[PDB]
Design a protein around this ligand. Structure first.
Ligand SMILES: NC(=O)c1ccc[n+]([C@@H]2O[C@H](COP(=O)([O-])OP(=O)(O)OC[C@H]3O[C@@H](n4cnc5c(N)ncnc54)[C@H](OP(=O)(O)O)[C@@H]3O)[C@@H](O)[C@H]2O)c1
Ligand SMILES: NC(=O)c1ccc[n+]([C@@H]2O[C@H](COP(=O)([O-])OP(=O)(O)OC[C@H]3O[C@@H](n4cnc5c(N)ncnc54)[C@H](OP(=O)(O)O)[C@@H]3O)[C@@H](O)[C@H]2O)c1
Ligand SMILES: O=C(O)[C@@H](O)[C@@H](O)[C@H](O)[C@H](O)CO
Ligand SMILES: O=C(O)[C@@H](O)[C@@H](O)[C@H](O)[C@H](O)CO
Lengths: 309, 309
């Protein structure tokens, strides 16, 4: 299934994220994911694997595995390129070997010191604090995103990690409304108010970190993984589905788009196999009690600034 | 003691906040405060007591208790007036019986449905959710705030409850940089990153809720008051000062402006008597341990939207 964006284009509700994929394995993983049925792929300039992603799509086309118009390809403008939107998008297209993108997102409501087109970096000052750019407004960046649509380079444009305040602001100054807000949300960070605000104004929600980040975010950020929660194990036993599949199905039934990442082809197939069962209202109501309002993914340590302060 | 704003004007580091002051008591409390030595007063249109504040100040001037030029008067633009900035400012001036304001703040990075000049309100829809405005950008509101300086109605302009992302944005689009960001901060919500960021770009920090809200915010918001903390008990015994005085002195030594509210004249005296001692480096490091990153004041219930979601 798929959600129709306010741009008119349909966006598959289950995609594959490629952050932290082993760069020597992305080609095999993406070709295997496409073969299994994945059509939506979530990329980013600052994941620094767009080239390998592009090689995978090219081989999938060359071997008749899929056609370009059957894929929904997202990438993202990094913080260091808020003043170079046209060049950054064209560079993403070059690395991905694509003529157009289905979706292009402002990765964060943060601009930092430009580090060169094709070479995105979060530059720290000599005190270990992000060199924040205080010259380029989010609105100025957005009006350049709007030109990408007018030039035919991007079908739909949107935002990532915008809260209620920033989303209200872009709704006020945009000429083309954002099609998507990609935010962290999962059973421990359910964020009902922000999802409901975005939906009220026709903005679709993509749930990044849709599993809660599992072991990867426990190690990297110290977050608690929801996947061994007793609520999910009861539902897992009842539906004969894994806790991860319960969580992804839950995200789908909340009318969100979910983009789990796995480096294991066995889990690629598992995460995609969530359309042969359903969660009841009571099941959904149980998962609601899991809410902790606890963010897992924060760039505070990497940037030397707690942007959520 | 005062901080020199980037506008050139001096703003006293201790002021009196008037939110939740009963209208039958404000005028006596303000005249008491002025007699004690208070010169900085934090008001807002939406506190619904500007008229009584102006009456107190008028009597203070008419009886030669103080002169207007030695007072620092702040008031704030309510969310309902982001599209009526100049008219809302002139209305505040008329209720306060002033020719100019020392400081005028955007109260929140939120615009909601207009409710009339001099009659600010947070209009809710039939489901209890704020009627959010999505036509007036924060930048548009700021450029009207900048006119108030040129018109001589306002000496210094600023913002309130802007986080790192919103502060970076206004630093980008402003022509007159904000002089003040008035944010919640106190020993249980120290927000080092946001204060550091604002200070880096010459924005003064006013700490609202500087005591942590005490018992009033426990009742209204469910927060834990820091005034019973074992650390402040030991520092109180050390300095023969109250936990509250310790907390306010801590705010001053963080180079912030602190605006505690009390409805009790003895506490008015107590809160102003914080310039006769100093906290040692070790004292401030002990207060640093109290950090729990826990916001007390939130409009979530009033607006039916968790804006911090
Ligand atoms: N816009 C943003 O700021 C932002 C932020 C964060 C993430 N994202 C995007 O969202 C995507 C997903 O987020 P994420 O990768 O951070 O976290 P996630 O998808 O919530 O979880 C990924 C972790 O879960 C494990 N996992 C995956 N499938 C599993 C299954 N069926 N059973 C058990 N464990 C499983 C993975 O391990 P294995 O790989 O070993 O299988 C990996 O460690 C990213 O790849 C990225 O595209 C965007
Ligand atoms: N911009 C914004 O969004 C925003 C938000 C919140 C507050 N503000 C401003 O900041 C001001 C201060 O914030 P606030 O009033 O909410 O909270 P606060 O000043 O941190 O604390 C006020 C509470 O502390 C008590 N108190 C005062 N002095 C005391 C002492 N020496 N010992 C023990 N308790 C004491 C008061 O009780 P009694 O009155 O009974 O003495 C009152 O209940 C407000 O008045 C308002 O002007 C602005
Ligand atoms: O997955 C994401 O988009 C986020 O986690 C980014 O902050 C990401 O960590 C950076 O682009 C990595 O450099
Ligand atoms: O003190 C403040 O400025 C805040 O607490 C406001 O949210 C306040 O609660 C409202 O303006 C009161 O109507």
């Amino acid at each position: 299934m798929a959600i129709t964006l306010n741009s008119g284009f349909k966006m598959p509700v289950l995609g594959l994220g490629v952050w932290r994929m082993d760069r020597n394995e992305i080609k095999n993983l993406l070709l295997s994911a496409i073969n299994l049925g994945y059509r939506h792929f979530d990329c980013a300039a600052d994941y620094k694997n767009e080239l390998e992603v592009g090689e995978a799509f090219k081989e999938a086309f060359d071997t008749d595995l899929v056609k370009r118009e059957d894929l929904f390809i997202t990438t993202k403008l990094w913080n260091s390129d808020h003043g170079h939107v046209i060049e950054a998008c064209k560079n993403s297209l070059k690395k991905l070997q694509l003529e157009y993108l289905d979706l292009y997102l402002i990765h964060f409501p943060m601009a930092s010191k430009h580090s060169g087109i094709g070479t995105t970096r979060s530059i720290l000052d000599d005190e270990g604090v992000l060199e924040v750019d205080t010259t380029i407004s989010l609105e100025a960046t957005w009006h350049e995103m709007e030109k990408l649509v007018e030039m035919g380079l991007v079908r739909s444009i949107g935002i990532s990690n915008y809260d209620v305040y920033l989303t209200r602001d872009i709704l006020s100054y945009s000429k083309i409304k954002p099609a998507v807000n990609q935010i962290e949300t999962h059973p421990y960070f359910q964020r009902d108010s922000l999802i409901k605000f975005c939906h009220k104004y026709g903005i679709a929600i993509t749930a990044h970190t849709p599993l809660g980040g599992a072991l990867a975010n426990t190690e990297r950020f110290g977050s608690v993984s929801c996947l061994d929660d007793p609520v999910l194990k009861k539902l897992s036993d009842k539906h004969n589905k894994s806790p991860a599949q319960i969580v992804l199905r839950w995200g789908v039934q909340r009318n969100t788009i979910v983009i789990p990442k796995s480096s294991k082809t066995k889990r690629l197939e598992e995460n995609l196999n969530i359309f042969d069962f359903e969660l009841s209202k009571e099941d959904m109501e149980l998962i609601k009690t899991m809410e902790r309002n606890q963010r897992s993914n924060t760039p505070a340590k990497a940037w030397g600034i707690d942007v959520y302060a």
